[PDB]
Design a protein around this nucleic acid. Structure first.
Ligand SMILES: [Mg+2]
Ligand SMILES: [Mg+2]
Ligand SMILES: [Mg+2]
Ligand SMILES: [Mg+2]
Ligand SMILES: [Mg+2]
Ligand SMILES: [Mg+2]
Ligand SMILES: [Mg+2]
Ligand SMILES: [Mg+2]
Ligand SMILES: [Mg+2]
Ligand SMILES: [Mg+2]
Ligand SMILES: [Mg+2]
Ligand SMILES: [Mg+2]
Ligand SMILES: [Mg+2]
Ligand SMILES: [Mg+2]
Ligand SMILES: [Mg+2]
Ligand SMILES: [Mg+2]
Ligand SMILES: [Mg+2]
Ligand SMILES: [Mg+2]
Ligand SMILES: [Mg+2]
Ligand SMILES: [Mg+2]
Ligand SMILES: [Mg+2]
Ligand SMILES: [Mg+2]
Ligand SMILES: [Mg+2]
Ligand SMILES: [Mg+2]
Ligand SMILES: [Mg+2]
Ligand SMILES: [Mg+2]
Ligand SMILES: [Zn+2]
Lengths: 44, 60, 122, 135, 193, 81
RNA sequence: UGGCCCUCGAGUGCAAAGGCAGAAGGGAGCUUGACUGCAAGACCCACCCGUCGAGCAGGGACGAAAGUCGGCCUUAGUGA
RNA sequence: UAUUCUGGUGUCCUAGGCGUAGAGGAACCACACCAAUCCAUCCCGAACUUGGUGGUUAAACUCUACUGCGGUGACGAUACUGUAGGGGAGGUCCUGCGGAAAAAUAGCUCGACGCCAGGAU
C-alpha cells in the first residue's frame, strides 16, 4: 500500500455482536457493532 | 489567422553593437498557434554570437 | 501477449538488444540474473564469440562469498570486479552494457558501478 | 432479371475474352446440360428468356439451375452525343462466358424432353452451344 | 438447509487465521482429498477480487465521483481508481477520456479481509436475502455477484449517504472449472441458492 | 463528379540491383513505405530511402520469413584478366 | 469490470497508396536537435526547381552508458 | 583431448508452429511461500525492486516421439508467352523453333550450426 493516499486500514477490528459475541476481523474501524450477521441469521 | 509567424529573440543580446568578435542579435523564427497557447513562448536555443545556448523569448 | 515472467523478460532482452550491438572494439556485456545465480558474459557479435565469462558458479566467488537465497549487492560487486580484472587482462577496455532485460537498478546497477571503479569503460 | 446489388465505381473496362473456362466446365448439379461453345457476352435479358423457355417447355419436369450470372457492368452514350465529356451510363449487365462453360443444368425429365427443351433454350442465346449428359 | 456458515461463526475467531489459515489448515486438505490432485499447487487459490462501480452520470458531477470514491475506500480500506472511457460513445453521451466508473483491485491479504467482511457481515445485513446464484460463474472458475446498493457495509454510515450507489464484485481464481471454484467459495462460507 | 487530375510519376523503385556495384552514399532504393529493410553497411533515410555506406556489391536477402532486406558487402577485384 | 478463443483483421491528426505488432500503434518521465557552420557522394532531371545523405567542428537534450536527436511512418499543405 | 547433460548466448534457414503421448528436480531453470528502509504501482509488492525461507515439477521451460492440424512442395502435362508464319467478317483460333507456370496431388517437415560457464564419463 502507498502511504498517505489510502484510508488507514486498521488491522484490528473486534466484532461485537449483541449476543455479547466478540470476534476478530479487520477494516478501518476498531470495533463493529452487529445485530445481524452470518451465524445467527434467518437462513439455514 | 489562428496560426502565426513568431519571432524568437535572444534575451541576452545587446543591440548596441558589442565589442566581441561577432556582433549581432540572434533571432530565430517559427510558428505558434495563438489560440491554443497564449503564453509568450520561451525557448532555450543556440546563439551564434554568445556561443552558448541562451534563452530566446518573443517579440510583439 | 506473454505474461509469463520468463517470456516477458526475454521480450525486453530482445528489445534492448535491437540497439546495443557487440563489435570487435566494443564488446557487449551481457547480464543474466536467475533466482539463485548471477551470471555475466562478454560477447563480440561479429565473431560470435564470448571473450570472458564470470559467474557465481565459479570457485572464486564460491570460496569468497556465500549467500542464503538471492544474490546480494555484495555478490554482484564481487562479480563486476572479477570481470573487470578478467577483461582488462585480455586487452578489453571499452565495452557496451547490455542490461539483458532487467531494469537498471539494484544489483544490476551495482554490477555496473563495480566494473566502472575497476577500470572497465562503459 | 439477374444483376449485382452494389459496386463502388459505376463504369468498367470492356475487357478481353480469351481462352477456355476450365472451372465452370463440369456438370455438378443436375443430369442434362447446355454447354457454351463460343466466346460471348450474355445479357441478363437473354438468360431470363432462355430459362423461361426451358421452364415452360419442361413444365411437368422438375429442375433448372442457371450456372451463370451477369455481374459485369456495361455502359452506353446516347444518340446525337458527340464523343468526349466522360464515359456513358450503365444500361444493362453482362455475364462473360468462354467456350466449355456450362450455362443451364436440368433434371427431372426423359432424355427426349430434355433435348427438345434445351434446343428451345439455345434458340434465345447469342451463341452456338451443345447438348451434354452427366458423367 | 446445509450450513457451511456454522464453520464461519463457529468460535470466537481471528482475521488472518480465519481466511489465510482456514485456507492452509482446512480448505487445502479438503480440496486435495475430495478432487484427488497429483500435486499441491493444483489447488484452486483466490487470486484477486476486483470491485467495480459503474456510474456514468457521475462524470457530469465530479463531487458525486469523489464521494463514491471515499465510500468505496471506507468499505475496502483502499482509495480507488477512476476509470476513463476509451471511445466516443453517442447514445450514452461520452467522449474519450471521460471518467466513467470507479474500480479497485484487492490482492493478497486485503482480498481475504474484504472477502470476510463480504460473506460474514454485509451479505446477511443486505435486503431480503435468499442465497447468491450458483450460476454466476463464467466457466473458467471466476465468480461475479452484484450489489444493488451499498448500505450493506457498516463503514458506510447510512444517514450520511447522499444517494444509493451500486457495486459489482468479481472473484478471480486459478480454478479452471466451476465445480472446484464452487466448492472453494462454499467451503469458505458462501450462501448459495 | 469530373475527373482528370493526376500526378507525375515519382521516380521510385530500385536504382541499383543485386550484385552490382555501389559507391558510398549512393542510393540503392527509393520507396514509399519500407518494402525493403536496411541490412548491414547500409543506412536508411527519412523517407525510407536506402543508401550505401561502403563501396561494394549490393545483395538482397530474406529478412525472414517473409520480408526482404538489402545489404552491401565489400568485394575483391584482383582477377584482372 | 473479470475471463477464455482468433492473432494483426484496430490504430497512424486529414485522401489514397505503400509501410508498421514487445512496433512507426497506447502511456509515463525529462526536454527543445522544430540547432549554428557545413558536407564526400548519389537520385530526379530540357532548363528553372526538387529529393537523400555518410562524415567534420561548435554549443547542447535525453540516457547509468552504448548511443540517438538538423521537426513530424512516407508521399500533398505551395509561388520564380 | 573427446563425449554427455544443464544454463547462458548467437548466426544460418526449408521459418521447426500448434496438438497428442512421454521424460526431467543431485546440479541447473522455474514457480511456490514469507517480509517490505533502495525503487514500485493513475488503485493493487500483480508487475518491477531489496532481503529471507525452503516447498514443488502443478504451471512454465526443457528433451524424445508422432502426420491430426499447420507449414513446405515437385516430375510430367496443360494455360501463358518470345520469335517465324497461317485461318477467321470479327470476337478470336492454329502451326514450327525456344522459354515455361499457377492450382492440384506424390512426397518433405516436429530445424541446422557455433562460442562460453558448469557438472559427468
Ligand atoms: Mg529471490
Ligand atoms: Mg492455345
Ligand atoms: Mg443462336
Ligand atoms: Mg503515381
Ligand atoms: Mg536522420
Ligand atoms: Mg486513411
Ligand atoms: Mg493502409
Ligand atoms: Mg511510440
Ligand atoms: Mg549525421
Ligand atoms: Mg559519427
Ligand atoms: Mg555535436
Ligand atoms: Mg549525464
Ligand atoms: Mg512520433
Ligand atoms: Mg520445407
Ligand atoms: Mg525442414
Ligand atoms: Mg510439467
Ligand atoms: Mg501433413
Ligand atoms: Mg498440407
Ligand atoms: Mg514441368
Ligand atoms: Mg508460339
Ligand atoms: Mg504471328
Ligand atoms: Mg510451345
Ligand atoms: Mg523445356
Ligand atoms: Mg517456379
Ligand atoms: Mg504449387
Ligand atoms: Mg531435435
Ligand atoms: Zn545572443
Amino acid at each position: 500500500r502507498k502511504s498517505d493516499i489510502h484510508p488507514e486500514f486498521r488491522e484490528d477490528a473486534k466484532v461485537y455482536c449483541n449476543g455479547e459475541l466478540v470476534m476478530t476481523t479487520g477494516g478501518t474501524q476498531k470495533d463493529y457493532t452487529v445485530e445481524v450477521w452470518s451465524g445467527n441469521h434467518p437462513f439455514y | 489567422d489562428v496560426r502565426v509567424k513568431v519571432i524568437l529573440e535572444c534575451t541576452g543580446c545587446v543591440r548596441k553593437s558589442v565589442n566581441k568578435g561577432s556582433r549581432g542579435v540572434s533571432r530565430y523564427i517559427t510558428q505558434k498557434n495563438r489560440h491554443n497557447t497564449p503564453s509568450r513562448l520561451e525557448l532555450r536555443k543556440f546563439c551564434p554570437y554568445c556561443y552558448k545556448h541562451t534563452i530566446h523569448g518573443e517579440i510583439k | 501477449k506473454a505474461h509469463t515472467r520468463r517470456e516477458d523478460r526475454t521480450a525486453r532482452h530482445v528489445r534492448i538488444r535491437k540497439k546495443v550491438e557487440g563489435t570487435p572494439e566494443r564488446p557487449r556485456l551481457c547480464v543474466f540474473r536467475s533466482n539463485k545465480h548471477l551470471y555475466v558474459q562478454v560477447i563480440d557479435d561479429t565473431k560470435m564469440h564470448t571473450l570472458a565469462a564470470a559467474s557465481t558458479m565459479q570457485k572464486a566467488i564460491s570460496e569468497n562469498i556465500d549467500y542464503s537465497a538471492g544474490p546480494t549487492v555484495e555478490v554482484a560487486q564481487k562479480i563486476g570486479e572479477m570481470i573487470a580484472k578478467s577483461c582488462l587482462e585480455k586487452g578489453i577496455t571499452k565495452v557496451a552494457f547490455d542490461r539483458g532485460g532487467y531494469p537498471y537498478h539494484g544489483r544490476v546497477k551495482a554490477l555496473a558501478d563495480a566494473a566502472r571503479e575497476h577500470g572497465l569503460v562503459f | 432479371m439477374l444483376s449485382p446489388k452494389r459496386t463502388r465505381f459505376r463504369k468498367q473496362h470492356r475487357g478481353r475474352m480469351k481462352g477456355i473456362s476450365y472451372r465452370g466446365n463440369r456438370i455438378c448439379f443436375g443430369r442434362y446440360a447446355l454447354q457454351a461453345l463460343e466466346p460471348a457476352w450474355i445479357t441478363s435479358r437473354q438468360i431470363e428468356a432462355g430459362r423461361r423457355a426451358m421452364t415452360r417447355n419442361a413444365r411437368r419436369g422438375g429442375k433448372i439451375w442457371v450456372r451463370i450470372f451477369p455481374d459485369k457492368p456495361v455502359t452506353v452514350r446516347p444518340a446525337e452525343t458527340r464523343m468526349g465529356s466522360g464515359k456513358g451510363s450503365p444500361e444493362y449487365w453482362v455475364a462473360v462466358v468462354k467456350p466449355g462453360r456450362i450455362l443451364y443444368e436440368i433434371s427431372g425429365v426423359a432424355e427426349n424432353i430434355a433435348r427438345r427443351a434445351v434446343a428451345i433454350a439455345a434458340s434465345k442465346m447469342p451463341i452456338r452451344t451443345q447438348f451434354i449428359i452427366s458423367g | 438447509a446445509a450450513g457451511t456458515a456454522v464453520f464461519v461463526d463457529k468460535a470466537e475467531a481471528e482475521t488472518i487465521n480465519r481466511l489465510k489459515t482456514n485456507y492452509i489448515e482446512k480448505m487445502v486438505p479438503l480440496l486435495k482429498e475430495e478432487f484427488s490432485y497429483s500435486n499441491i499447487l493444483e489447488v484452486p487459490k483466490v487470486v484477486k477480487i476486483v470491485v467495480n462501480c459503474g456510474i456514468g452520470d457521475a462524470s457530469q458531477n465530479a463531487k458525486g465521483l469523489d464521494a463514491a470514491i471515499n465510500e468505496l475506500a471506507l468499505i475496502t480500506g483502499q482509495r480507488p481508481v477512476k476509470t476513463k472511457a476509451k471511445t466516443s460513445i453517442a447514445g450514452f453521451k461520452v467522449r474519450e477520456g471521460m471518467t466513467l466508473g470507479i474500480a479497485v483491485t484487492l490482492r493478497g491479504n486485503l482480498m481475504y479481509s474484504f472477502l470476510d467482511r463480504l460473506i460474514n457481515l454485509a451479505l446477511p445485513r443486505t435486503r431480503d436475502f435468499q442465497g447468491v446464484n450458483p450460476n454466476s460463474f463464467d466457466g473458467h472458475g471466476n465468480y461475479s455477484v452484484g450489489f444493488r446498493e451499498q448500505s450493506v457495509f457498516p463503514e458506510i454510515k447510512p444517514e450520511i449517504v447522499g444517494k444509493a450507489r451500486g457495486m459489482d464484485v468479481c472473484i478471480t481464481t486459478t480454478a479452471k472449472t466451476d465445480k472446484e471454484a464452487y466448492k472453494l467459495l462454499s467451503l469458505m462460507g458462501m450462501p448459495f441458492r | 463528379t469530373k475527373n482528370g487530375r493526376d500526378s507525375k510519376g515519382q521516380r521510385l523503385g530500385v536504382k541499383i540491383y543485386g550484385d552490382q556495384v555501389a559507391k558510398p552514399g549512393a542510393i540503392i532504393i527509393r520507396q514509399r513505405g519500407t518494402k525493403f529493410h536496411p541490412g548491414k553497411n547500409v543506412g536508411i533515410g527519412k523517407d525510407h530511402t536506402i543508401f550505401a555506406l561502403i563501396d561494394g556489391l549490393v545483395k538482397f536477402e530474406k529478412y525472414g520469413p517473409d520480408k526482404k532486406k538489402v545489404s552491401v558487402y565489400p568485394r575483391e577485384i584482383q582477377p584482372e584478366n
